[PDB]
Amino acid sequence: KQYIISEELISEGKWVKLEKTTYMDPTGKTRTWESVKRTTRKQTADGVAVIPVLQRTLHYECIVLVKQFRPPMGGYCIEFPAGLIDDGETPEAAALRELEEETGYKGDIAECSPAVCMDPGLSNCTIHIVTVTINGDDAENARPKPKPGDGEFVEVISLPKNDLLQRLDALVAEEHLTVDARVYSYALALKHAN
Amino acid sequence: KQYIISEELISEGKWVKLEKTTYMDPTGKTRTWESVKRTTRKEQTADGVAVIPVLQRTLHYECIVLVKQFRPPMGGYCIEFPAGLIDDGETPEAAALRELEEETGYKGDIAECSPAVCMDPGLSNCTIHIVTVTINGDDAENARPKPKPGDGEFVEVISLPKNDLLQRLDALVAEEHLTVDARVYSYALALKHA
Ligand SMILES: C[C@@H](N)c1ccc(-c2cncnc2)cc1
Ligand SMILES: C[C@@H](N)c1ccc(-c2cncnc2)cc1
Ligand SMILES: [Cl-]
Ligand SMILES: [Mg+2]
Ligand SMILES: [Mg+2]
Ligand SMILES: [Mg+2]
Ligand SMILES: [Mg+2]
């Protein structure tokens, strides 16, 4: 019933552009929206986010997260490891590379989502959520070597999966950080299950 | 260590703006970023709310109540948690219960309310509270729920069992052109992983 009529460029930066979208509502009334898009997509999606399950025998399973200064937020955020998918990369492979660059961990693909939207009221940004287990007992993950590209400054924070939500709430209360909504959603459902 | 130096307007719409952010990196070097922000945020603790609505009924498996809407930024239909912006002076909890009723017809009870969490911190400053609400579907008020959408809001309600949410979401994605929201997918993945 609904569809895009036209998109007017309002402003293009190097990384992000702003558009005026004209669309047909289900009545037959023409309406407008202000949309954002990244200029970097071709791809299955703009990016990947990695859910990295760190498994070490005789330890709690942990979820590996990253803390970074985020200039749109003017502050530090706690997120799943994540980045853009390179021209001609599969989402799986983008996931293992990002996880290594950002955390030093080398992991295994467990499962891969379809393309899912980041903030559909605002942007067309999409990611694949890639679940990855990390054999924390293998020698290659013993002393993880993070390989951060230019201008990435990443702190690695591992939290137990079985208490994820309480541990994040504690970091927020103590450290003036913003947790990522996907992280929080995941943490919430771990408590809401069963 | 890192902090904002300046924020320069590039382009302001009625609803969304684009800014050039200058910040200090942890090496002591100036860098820039392109930041999106919504024009509607005032004194709220966040831009919006998303509602995790747990529909409870005697002799029924618990359902998660979701909404399907056309999203002009995406050029297509998206499956999301019920959600909207927080009105000036409104509490996140009030916004949540109101949005939930407007979009779905259901009258919820507050369970919990997150701190403000970021939607896409590499792109925007946009934040929400994620509000978990239970719906007593045995209450006569919630028997034949009537949406009360606002102007230009066109919503379909989809209720899926919590105990099979991820497979049911995948089935819907198999049947049509539609994108699942990343928070919904994250929550569904955690329910499997638990
Ligand atoms: C119903 C009407 N008051 C309205 C119309 C469009 C929008 C909007 C939101 N985000 C991006 N672009 C446009 C908000 C409100
Ligand atoms: C590596 C460095 N040239 C760089 C710097 C900034 C960004 C960026 C991304 N999204 C929005 N705004 C800015 C991407 C890359
Ligand atoms: Cl897992
Ligand atoms: Mg990253
Ligand atoms: Mg990266
Ligand atoms: Mg809404
Ligand atoms: Mg609404």
If one counts the domains in chain A, the total is: 1
Both tokens of B37, joined, read: 């922000």
In degrees and rounded to multiples of 5, residue A191 shows phi and psi of -70, -40
Write down the residue that tokens 């909404």 correspond to.
Answer: B67
Amino acid at A177: L
Q: In b/e form, how buried is each residue of B103-139, taking b as 16+ CB within 10 angstroms?
A: bbbbebeeeebbbbbbbbbbbbbbbbbbbbbebbbee
- Helix ranges (DSSP H) in chain B: 92-104, 165-175, 182-193
B124/A72 CB distance under 8 A: yes
Amino acid at B154: F
Residue A149 CA: nearest ligand 2 atom is 1
User: What span, in angstroms and rounded, lies between the C-alpha atoms of A156 and A65?
Assistant: 6
Which chain A residues are Cβ-neighbours of B188 within 8 angstroms? 189
User: What span, in angstroms and rounded, lies between the C-alpha atoms of B51 and B65?
Assistant: 9
Answer whether A59's CB lies under 8 Å from A160's CB: no
If you ran DSSP here, which 8-state letter would residue A180 be given? B
User: What range defines the domain where residue A55 resides?
Assistant: 1-194
Write down the residue that tokens 């934040």 correspond to.
Answer: B127
Contacts of B140 (CB under 8 A, 6+ apart): none
β-pair partners for A128: A48
Three-state DSSP class for residue A28: coil
Both tokens of B42, joined, read: 């005032």
DSSP annotation string for B158-189 = EEEEGGGHHHHHHHHHHHSS-EEBHHHHHHHH
- Which protein residue's CA is at the shortest distance from atom 8 of ligand 1? A33
User: What span, in angstroms and rounded, lies between the C-alpha atoms of B28 and A130?
Assistant: 34
Taking Cα atoms as reference points, which of A66, A53, A48 lies closest to residue A135?
A53
Q: What resolution in angstrom units was achieved for this structure?
A: 1.5
β-pair partners for B16: B38
Give the gap in angstroms from C-alpha B143 to the nearest C-alpha of chain A. 24
What H or E segment, with its residue span, contains residue B115?
none
User: What span, in angstroms and rounded, lies between the C-alpha atoms of B14 and B40?
Assistant: 9
Three-state DSSP class for residue A185: helix
B49 touches chain A (CB under 8 A): no
Answer whether B128's CB lies under 8 Å from A181's CB: yes
In degrees and rounded to multiples of 5, residue A111 shows phi and psi of -160, 165
Which CATH number is B13's domain given? Answer: 3.90.79.10
β-pair partners for B88: none
Residue numbers of A between 54 and 93 with CB closer than 8 Å to B:
69-74, 76-77, 79, 82
Residues with CB under 6 A from ligand 2: A 15-16, 150-151; B 33-34, 122
Give the other-Cβ count within 10 Å of A85's Cβ: 25
Residue B13 CA: nearest ligand 1 atom is 12
Answer whether B65's CB lies under 8 Å from B57's CB: no
Contacts of B9 (CB under 8 A, 6+ apart): B17, B18, B19
DSSP E strands in chain B: the ranges are: 3-12, 16-24, 30-38, 48-56, 63-71, 76-80, 83-85, 109-113, 117-118, 127-136, 156-161, 179-180
In degrees and rounded to multiples of 5, residue A39 shows phi and psi of -80, -5
- Helix ranges (DSSP H) in chain A: 91-103, 164-175, 181-192
Ligand nearest to the CA of B166: 3
Three-state DSSP class for residue B138: coil
Q: Crossing angle for the helix pair A181-192 and A164-175, nearest 10 degrees?
A: 140
Answer whether A99's CB lies under 8 Å from A132's CB: yes
Answer whether B157's CB lies under 8 Å from B103's CB: yes
Residue numbers of B between 165 and 194 with CB closer than 8 Å to A:
170, 173, 179-191, 193-194
CA distances from B114 to A81, A181, B30, B93 (A): 21, 10, 34, 10
Flag whether A34 is marked binding: yes
